């Protein structure tokens, strides 16, 4: 049941984002309702999250592949829908496996960002 409910919620989110994408392209992303901005951000993360590096494309991707167990697919997406990962950067979900890989990539991105901020601040 949890698998079914999560899948339907994901589909509904992506369906709505598609409809909002028509407005976004013409006018702009900033002409939308604040509620629809949250949906867009979650939908974009879902789209990035759905990507996965395959073990057979280590040449074209340049990265080690992943095997995601179904139980981690359900849990990771279910948490993302609830919004517990809103603080995570959007790009952290791109070309990764389970939620754990997302967090690890986010940590590395944060460390790099902190290093850049430290370099900029030290420049003063």
């Amino acid at each position: 049941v949890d698998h079914y409910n999560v899948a339907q919620d994901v589909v509904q989110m992506l369906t709505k984002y598609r409809e909002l994408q028509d407005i976004i392209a013409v006018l702009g992303i900033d002409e939308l309702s604040e509620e629809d901005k949250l949906i867009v951000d979650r939908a974009r993360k879902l789209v990035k999250f759905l990507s996965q590096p395959f073990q057979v494309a280590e040449v074209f991707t340049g990265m080690t592949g992943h095997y995601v167990q179904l139980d981690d697919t359900i849990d990771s997406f279910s948490g993302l829908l609830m919004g517990t990962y809103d603080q995570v950067p959007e790009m952290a979900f791109y070309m990764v496996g389970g939620i754990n890989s997302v967090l690890e990539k986010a940590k590395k991105m944060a460390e790099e960002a902190a290093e850049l901020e430290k370099m900029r601040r030290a420049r003063v």
Binding site: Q87, I99, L103, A110, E111, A113, A114, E117
Partner: peptide, 30 residues
């Protein structure tokens, strides 16, 4: 209080999330 008397995979996700949130907050400060 009475709970004190007598009385893990998900913890790892919480731990990583807390660390990432801490890093994102620290960069904001300075």
């Amino acid at each position: 209080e009475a709970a004190e008397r007598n009385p893990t995979g998900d913890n790892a996700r919480d731990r990583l999330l807390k660390e990432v949130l801490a890093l994102q907050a620290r960069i904001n400060q300075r």
